[PDB]
């Protein structure tokens, strides 16, 4: 799949546990972690729509109470081909 699941948090404990939720919830590969800046760190994962949805559900449930907690999460399902260079 090409659906884009993705998580935002403050700190790398929530980042990597969100990655663990990604890789334990559904068949989703992460296209990349990123240090946004000012403490913001995000994870970008690719997989099927239901797969990325289950992954983001797991990340949100396991993330909000870790460190500062989850800041944002979003569920792009059809990333247009023009957006791929941005990731």
């Amino acid at each position: 799949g090409i659906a884009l699941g993705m998580i935002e948090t403050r700190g790398l404990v929530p980042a990597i546990e969100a990655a663990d939720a990604m890789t334990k919830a559904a068949e989703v590969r992460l296209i990349g972690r990123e240090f946004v800046g000012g403490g913001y760190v995000t994870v970008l994962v690719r997989g099927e729509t239901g797969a990325v949805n289950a992954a983001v559900r797991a990340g949100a449930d396991a993330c909000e109470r870790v460190g500062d907690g989850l800041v944002a999460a979003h569920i792009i399902a059809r990333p247009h081909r023009e957006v791929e260079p941005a990731l």
């Binding site: 239901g50 289950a54 559900r57 949100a60 999460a73 979003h74």
Partner: protein, 102 residues
């Protein structure tokens, strides 16, 4: 006569057909036909209230009626949090900004 016969489904739908239900007439098929614990029962309810006095509760309502985040009625299966289907509870109370799915 009136070949058109109104029969009420187990859930409460009026279907005008011919049916297969019971009556005081033609015999050989009464034999106490009341026990009803079967999925996809096409047996009419009228048989059950007129001849058995026990009304079961319906099935085959595969349509799962959900409300879209913008408060309008969607349906057709459904992929949310079922009360009896477990192992999907975590995350039920979280926000998923973006392409709506639940």
């Amino acid at each position: 006569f009136e070949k058109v016969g109104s029969y009420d489904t187990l859930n409460g739908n009026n279907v005008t057909g011919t049916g297969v239900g019971r009556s005081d007439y033609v015999t050989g098929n009464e034999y106490g036909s009341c026990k009803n614990l079967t999925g996809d029962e096409y047996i009419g309810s009228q048989q059950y209230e007129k001849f058995c006095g026990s009304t079961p509760k319906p099935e085959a309502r595969k349509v799962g009626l959900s409300l879209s985040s913008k408060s309008n009625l969607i349906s057709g299966t459904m992929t949310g949090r079922s009360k009896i289907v477990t192992g999907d509870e975590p995350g039920s109370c979280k926000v998923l900004t973006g392409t709506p799915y639940a």
